Amino acid sequence: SGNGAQGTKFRISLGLPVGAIMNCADNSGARNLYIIAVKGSGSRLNRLPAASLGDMVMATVKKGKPELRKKVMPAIVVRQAKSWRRRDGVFLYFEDNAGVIANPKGEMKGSAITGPVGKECADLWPRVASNSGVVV
Amino acid sequence: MQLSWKDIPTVAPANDLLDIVLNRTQRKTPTVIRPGFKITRIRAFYMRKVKYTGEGFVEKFEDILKGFPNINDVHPFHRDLMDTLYEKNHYKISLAAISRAKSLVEQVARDYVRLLKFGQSLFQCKQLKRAALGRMATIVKKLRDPLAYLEQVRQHIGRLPSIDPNTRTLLICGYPNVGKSSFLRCITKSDVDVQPYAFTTKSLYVGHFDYKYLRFQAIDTPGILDRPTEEMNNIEMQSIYAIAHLRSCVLYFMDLSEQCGFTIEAQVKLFHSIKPLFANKSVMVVINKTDIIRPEDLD
Amino acid sequence: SQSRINNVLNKIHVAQPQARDDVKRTPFIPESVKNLKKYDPEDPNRRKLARDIEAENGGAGVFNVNLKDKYLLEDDEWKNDIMPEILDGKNVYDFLDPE
Amino acid sequence: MGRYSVKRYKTKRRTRDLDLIYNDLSTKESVQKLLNQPLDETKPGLGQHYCIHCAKYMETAIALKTHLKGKVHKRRVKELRGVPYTQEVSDAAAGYNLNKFLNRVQEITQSVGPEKESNEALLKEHLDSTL
Amino acid sequence: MATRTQFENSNEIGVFSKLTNTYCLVAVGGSENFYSAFEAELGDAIPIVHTTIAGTRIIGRMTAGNRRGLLVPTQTTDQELQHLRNSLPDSVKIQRVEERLSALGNVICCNDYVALVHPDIDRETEELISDVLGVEVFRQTISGNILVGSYCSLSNQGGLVHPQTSVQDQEELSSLLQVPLVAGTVNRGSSVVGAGMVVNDYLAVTGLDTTAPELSVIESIFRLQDAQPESISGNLRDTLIETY
Amino acid sequence: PQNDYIERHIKQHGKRLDHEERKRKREARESHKISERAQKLTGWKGKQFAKKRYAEKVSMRKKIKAHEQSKVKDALPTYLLDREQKFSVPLPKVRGISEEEMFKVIKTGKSRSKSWKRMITKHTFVGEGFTRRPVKMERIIRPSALRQKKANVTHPELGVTVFLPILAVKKNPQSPMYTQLGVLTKGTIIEVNVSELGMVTAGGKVVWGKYAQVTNEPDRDGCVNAVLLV
Amino acid sequence: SYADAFGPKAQRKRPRLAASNLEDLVKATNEDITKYEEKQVLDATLGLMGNQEDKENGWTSAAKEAIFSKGQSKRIWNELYKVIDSSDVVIHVLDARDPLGTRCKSVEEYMKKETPHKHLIYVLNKCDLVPTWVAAAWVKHLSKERPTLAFHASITNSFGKGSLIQLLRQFSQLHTDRKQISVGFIGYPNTGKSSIINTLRKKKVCQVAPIPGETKVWQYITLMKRIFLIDCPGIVPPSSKDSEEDILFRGVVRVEHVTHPEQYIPGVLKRCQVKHLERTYEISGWKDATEFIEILARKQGRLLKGGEPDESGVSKQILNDFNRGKIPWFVLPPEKE
RNA sequence: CUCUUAAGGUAGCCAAUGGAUUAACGAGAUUCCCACUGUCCCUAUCUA
Ligand SMILES: Nc1nc2c(ncn2[C@@H]2O[C@H](COP(=O)(O)OP(=O)(O)O)[C@@H](O)[C@H]2O)c(=O)[nH]1
Ligand SMILES: Nc1nc2c(ncn2[C@@H]2O[C@H](COP(=O)(O)OP(=O)(O)O)[C@@H](O)[C@H]2O)c(=O)[nH]1
Ligand SMILES: [K+]
Ligand SMILES: [Mg+2]
Ligand SMILES: [Mg+2]
Ligand SMILES: [Mg+2]
Ligand SMILES: [Zn+2]
């Protein structure tokens, strides 16, 4: 489930394969994040690594501060547009795919998160829940 | 600073390293080639043999070279300690021998791949590959003594205590058999031996404690004799270098009952002789074994 | 050294309040809290903790704690009562109301 | 299902909602903030010439004027007249939080409504003057 | 009266727990070790309640309250609300709040008398806070940092703010809250102090990674032990100079 | 732990209670285990085991001989002690090498219809100031990787081998064509620079060029070995 | 030996060079500590503020693009060694705008060490892109090392053709024992070797293009009955002091395959004069590279769908113009003595 | 007998311009970007 995550993770429908671009939901100055790798991904021929809500990816900043650009950093997905099933009894989805920039220990670079944050991601990552103002 | 050098991989000797690399080549590369195959296939087979063996030797040498500390680039206290323990000249010479052997192996591999590009028969390609491997083996066999020295040095240096030269430090010094190790046992949880004969402690020992929510390290040193530096030996040089380098609070221990085997005049003389060592450091003189004789009832 | 001055001052200073109103804000400590006896891990007569109950029953990951045992209800027989939720397509919770 | 509806109303191509636009138009301060925006290079017209009703940026003042002289803007204005259909409307239609919905409708009629209408009239005359 | 523990090898105590003067809330995940760690210090004097908020374990981040009231977000289910009501005595009011900022623990930093709130909460939410918690309400940031409930730890005795708070802001917030405030870190260099620890007028709980100088500063500012006021800063100045 | 903590632990706590007996029994089983390894190991491991056993036996016999010999019981100056180190050629006849083995046919053209270029497959010496001829006129090809400049020359007197530069190819025994092409095969007479050997004639002239004969196959072993003709 | 130095059988017990006295020892240790602290501060200025801090956040710099490794392939360098081995005269072609930048010093050292009989000269091409005095100063400075000829390559309107031809005739007469001589043209890509050969022949015999790697194999051109010319692919010697920005600005890589040219645009700003840039692009009023790109895009109509300016496309066009000579610029020659 | 390093401070003299770095056109050959998408992840369904 990755280093820094709080416990095990149940399966969520994958919406972001490698090569996807998502928004940046923190206040570190990055505008978008380009997914190049998914942490904890398995191995199968011809299959692209994909990430869901609450996953950690390796991303490069495409738009934002030039100091943040041209570097690879860990990110945590906090919103996805692909619908997924909650065990309470509903399928649901967000407007956009959005992630936040973090460290290998799962600590946010920014100080706050704009927009809603998924319940699964907030429960899996304590620092995301600490920096979230809206949790679903 | 790194402060600890235990994570150095095992250094095999010359014959064992040769066996490891050559048998890895024989196992991990294909071994069946036929004289009826194409000359391009035969040449590629023997080129792969030479290149893989060269890469194995080079990666072993690089694992040796990266692991060991740089004696000149570390803090001067650690540099002096490792010079006293392992003879910095021999240290650098052995590591330079390893580096030169790596360069020679790379050159042999490149030259013999280039020569194997022009092989005309399986016999000739086999001879060129055997020549390349034999030259690599001669280069490795020339490293018999530095590899053994480096393995011994690695085993010793992995067990050295970690000393931070910039933290809060209490040095303990004096003559043998005065109670330095006993005081270290009293104030810390170090397992230094306490025995009633001189030089039970042959190396620096470290303990730790907490005072006012701050971590302090206490250093027990081997005994120092009242001798000039020209006839001073390495065991005493450890203590001398520790006192000279570690900006700290030095505690000079004195025995007034002379059960340590040294007179009070000799202890005072040793204190005045090591007086130039503690400049711009805190100094305190601790009179031990007061349960035997007190400073008040002295002559 | 003058470099470690401003940061040291800003981290050593303790801000103090000053009046702003004549309203008394006193710390609250319950009488049971201040009469509570200190817990001793090595004591023959100590309180039986929840982890002790868990260890004696099933251990961690096997013991099923009854969350209704701590309910402060008018009748103690009402603790293990199943509260109805759905009746004929209506939620009972938004009809539940005194008087 | 069909290609036209899919490629118009895909999730990633969603537009701002009527209740949010109504809340934006209700207060004069929000109207002033949307009229005076910082110069953004990622928006058409440097973030200027923004129609609040349609939530749409224009590249030029003439483009904004032609948009105002159009049936699409009139359709949006006609849509933004009544109650913005929050969740309370559907709840009260089902028979849930009826008093809350009635109080919300009364507050919209009494306080929010006329102030929003006056703000819309002020925005209209300001656009007419500046255009 | 400052202890160290972890919730499943995590130092973020304030994320998974809520502590007031009259009750304690703990997450239901896993074993009973976290509950027993709170119970060793609290006894049976105040109720300690296993609870979930919207099926999650982040109850200190999702909820906020003091000795008189407890506010839960709109995602709290009727069953969770009923469980909280059945577990707690009548002297603690319980309210479900229709607020866009559902992370009440992040957006509200309160004690028994004062409250700092996010500058963008609803007016009805502010009035509900004043009615239920019975406290004065101020819209504030901790030196430009929103989420005051996660970046400040507050009790009736003192307060701990994140170390990037300026001296002028510390003075202004101390005047607003009528308690002494100090800037410091918890959990060995973490700046999220409110999510790092829980505290009341007689108990503080931090993570295992919290160092001795940090614990000493926490005890000094929250006045936990009998001989630990807020004026021992002069005595701990040498230790703090060495640490910083 | 610090310094010799395992030795200190042995000194302060001892070892396991069955350590001595277990070690003694393992060393007693060692003979059976050696025999079973010799009879059971197959292939490369078995060959290596037999080779190592032979080497150990030779070493043991030499040690026994040295002990028995011990129990039974150049006229250099002062500054040199305590310091250590017919006109027939040595190879009058070598293996003949045909032109088919010596040259490799190189084909040119889009359909590879032309076959006039020949590449020399042996090692060559091209001398100083060598520039390749233009490719349109280059019939004989001597690739650069096969060009040699130095050789390991062994002096019969004093028994030393020195890496010396090559001066000329005097005689290739196969053909004068190969001699003038500079082919370096076995039995070839070459001229080498002997400046570092410090040879002086009877008249006081310093010798810096002599003749040597190639004694190996450089196309086989990648290097040129020669014996100085003295 | 090592065995006596350290180990079970060690016999060393005292330092080899014992200290004279404790005062000298403490003075030496204090000096060593001071030097160590000064060195630590000197490396904390750059390396610790750089590489060391990045691993704390887990950040890693992006992989270096392979488009910057062009000119360093084994096939190209085999071709280079082939043309050198076949050449009697070697002409090193330099760009008049950056002659020290476009020099193959390692190749020159190899030629002067291993092939001293091959004659190496300098041709300073594209002298029409620099002022007259700049070209004269560069010729004077480079003549202190090697015979340097100023040149401007063109089939119709060229400069230096007769001088190069008479110098080659001098070389041919010097090597009169040889039936012919070969002159191989080496240097950086896009310096104009094929253009110089076409200028000498007064005919387009070698392919010429601004794109790097237009010439991929060697080519023989008969200039006279006794003179052959060898066109060679461009080479970029590997180095550590030369960065990706320098490699890009030496006209070495294809701009279409770089990731972010907007970060290289400040290099254009630092290398070009403000007056020259504003005359070329008919714009002004910028305060940084982003403003320059935005103003140029809005003036030229390079807008993406939705009004966004095309930063990457404008940056690529600017870099192409800089490399291909639609913007005037040069590197100052060394000062006169 | 002799030959080449005199040119100098971001655009010169010398004869609008100093040009083939040639507009336009092209089922000519090549590279890249936006948009777009079942090319792909990863395949499913419908009609003749
Ligand atoms: N009576 C007495 N004996 C001591 C005291 N300290 C040390 N000793 C004795 O001194 C002997 C050796 O002391 P030791 O700790 O090895 O001193 P060191 O050689 O400087 O490390 C031990 O056998 C102890 O019994 C003390 O305070 N009182
Ligand atoms: N202004 C100017 N441009 C030149 C000159 N020589 C070459 N060029 C240009 O440089 C570009 C690349 O030249 P090219 O001969 O292909 O470089 P190569 O890689 O060395 O062969 C061509 O488009 C030419 O127009 C010169 O003397 N002056
Ligand atoms: K080119
Ligand atoms: Mg595949
Ligand atoms: Mg001792
Ligand atoms: Mg070319
Ligand atoms: Zn409109």
From first CA to last CA, the distance across chain G in angstroms is: 56
First to last CA, chain B: 50
Yes or no: say if F176 and F187 are a contact pair by the CB < 8 Å rule. Answer: no
Task: Identify the bridge partners of residue E108 per DSSP, sorted by sequence position.
Answer: E117
- Residue A1: inside a domain, yes or no? no
- Specified resolution (Å): 2.4
Q: In whole angstroms, what is the distance from residue A4 CA to residue G208 CA?
A: 58
Please state, as a whole number, how many other Cβ atoms lie within 10 Å of the Cβ of residue G66.
9
Name which of G28, G34, G5 is nearest B241 in CA terms: G28
A37 close to E (CB below 8 A): no
- Quick one: CA dihedral E225, E231, E235, E238, positive or negative? positive
Q: Are E63 and E70 in contact (CB under 8 A)?
A: yes
Q: Residues for chain C: how many in total?
A: 99
CATH number, domain of A119, equals 2.40.150.20
Q: Are F217 and F161 in contact (CB under 8 A)?
A: no
- What distance in Å separates the CA atoms of residue G336 and residue G293, rounded to the nearest whole number? 38
Residues 6+ apart with CB under 8 A from D10: none
Residue F134 is nearest to which of G81, G86, G118, comparing CB atoms?
Answer: G86
- Inter-CA distances, E15 with E87, E104, F58, G147, Å: 21, 12, 74, 77
Which amino acid, residue B74? V
CA G89 to chain centre: 22
The H or E element spanning position G120 is strand G119-125
- H or E element, residue B157: helix B144-157
Residues whose CB is less than 8 angstroms from the CB of residue B282 and which lie 6 or more positions away in sequence, other chains included = B248, B249, B250
| Cβ < 6 A, ligand 1 pocket | B 176-182, 194-196, 200-201, 288-289, 291-292
Q: Whose CA is nearest to atom 26 of ligand 1?
A: B289
CB D127 within 8 A of CB D73: no
Q: Is residue A96 part of a domain?
A: yes
In a domain, residue A10? The reply is no
- Whether A122 and E58 lie within 8 Å, measured CB to CB: yes
Q: Which of residues 48-77 of A touch strand H (CB under 7 A)?
A: 48, 50
For residue A112, being part of any structural domain is answered with yes
Which residue type, as a one-letter code, is found at position E105? G
Domain interval for residue A24: 15-136
What tokens does B16 get? Answer: 């064992």
C-alpha G193 – ligand 6 centre gap (Å): 6
Residues with Cβ < 8 Å from G51, sequence gap 6 or more?
A: none
Half-sphere exposure of F172 (CA within 13 A, CB side): 21
Report DSSP letters for A70-108, one per residue. Answer: SEEEEEEEEE-SS-EEETTTEEE--SS-EEEEB-TT--B
Pocket test for ligand 1, best of B194, B225, B294 (most atoms within 8 A of CB): B194
How many residues are listed for chain D in this entry? 131
B153 contacts B86 by C-beta, under 8 angstroms: yes
Query: Amino acid identity of B96?
Result: A
| Residues A117 and A95: beta-carbon distance below 8 Å | no
Nearest chain C Cα to E113, which residue?
C25
Q: Does A17 touch chain D (CB under 8 A)?
A: no
Distance (Å, whole) CA G163 – CA G169:
10
Name which of G81, G182, G224, G231 to mutate to probe chain F: the one with the most chain F Cβ atoms within 10 A of its Cβ: G182
In a domain, A101, yes or no: yes
Using the atom order of ligand 2, give the atom closest to the CA of residue G234.
19
Rounded Cα distance, B206 and B209, in Å: 10
Structure tokens, D108: 């919209």
Calpha distance C82→B81 (Å, rounded): 75
User: Closest Cα partner for E157 from C32, C20, C34, C28?
Assistant: C28
Pairwise CA distance, residues F141 & F133, whole Å = 9
Long-range pairs, E3-9, Cβ under 8 A, ≥24: E3/E37, E3/E41, E3/E203, E3/E204, E3/E205, E3/E206, E4/E205, E4/E206, E4/E207, E4/E208, E4/E210, E4/E215, E5/E34, E5/E37, E5/E205, E5/E207, E5/E208, E6/E207, E6/E208, E7/E34, E8/A6, E8/A7, E8/E34
**Distance from the alpha carbon of residue G30 to the mean position of ligand 5, in angstroms:** 28
**What is the CA B176 to chain-centroid distance, rounded?**
26
Q: How many residues does chain E have?
A: 244
Q: Are A124 and A9 in contact (CB under 8 A)?
A: yes
Q: In whole angstroms, give the CA distance from residue E99 to residue G218.
A: 75
Phi and psi (nearest 5°) for E115?
Answer: -145, 135
| Alpha-carbon distances, residue B187 vs B168, B174, B287, G104 (angstroms) | 15, 17, 16, 67
The domain tally of chain A equals: 1
SS3 at position F137: coil
Q: How many CA atoms lie within 13 A of G288 on its CB side?
A: 3
CB neighbours of F43 closer than 8 A, spacing ≥ 6? none
Q: CA-CA distance, B223 to B195, in Å (whole number)? A: 13
G308, closest nucleotide (Cα–C1')? H34
Can you read off the two tokens belonging to residue B2? 């790194």
With H, G, I as helix, E, B as strand and everything else as coil, classify residue E232.
Answer: coil
Q: Chain-centre distance of CA G198, in angstroms?
A: 24
Residue A44 counted as domain residue: yes
Residue C77: C-alpha distances to residues A90, B84, C91, E50, E72 (Å): 36, 81, 25, 21, 28
- Report the candidate in B11, B19, B18, B21 with the shortest Cα–Cα distance to residue B148: B11
C-alpha B156/C-alpha B152 separation (Å) is: 6
Burial of residue G141 (number of CB atoms within 10 Å: 0-12, 13-18, 19+) = middle
What whole-number distance in Å separates Cα of residue B292 and Cα of residue D67?
105
Spatial separation of the C-alpha atoms in residues E34 and F17, rounded to whole Å: 43
Mutate to test the interface with E, among C8, C12, C31, C47 (most CBs of E within 10 A): C12
Q: How much is the CA Rg of chain C, to the nearest whole Å?
A: 26
From residue E196, give the alpha-carbon distance in Å to each of D111, E28, E221, E222.
Answer: 44, 19, 16, 15
Residue D108 per-residue DSSP state? I
Q: Which helix (H) or strand (E) element contains residue E234?
A: helix E233-243
Q: Is D43 on the interface with G (CB under 8 A)?
A: yes
Asked if residues E19 and E200 have their Cβ atoms less than 8 Å apart, the reply is yes
Residue F77: count other Cβ atoms within 10 Å of its Cβ: 6
Decide: E101 and A134 in contact? Cβ < 8 Å. yes
Find the angle CA(F44)-CA(B131)-CA(B23) to the nearest 5 degrees. 25
Q: Which helix (H) or strand (E) holds B147?
A: helix B144-157
- Residue A2 resides in a domain: no
Closest by CA to F164, choosing from F126, F124, F214, F93, is F214
CB B123 within 8 A of CB B43: no
Q: Are F12 and F1 in contact (CB under 8 A)?
A: no
Q: Is B177 annotated as a binding residue?
A: yes
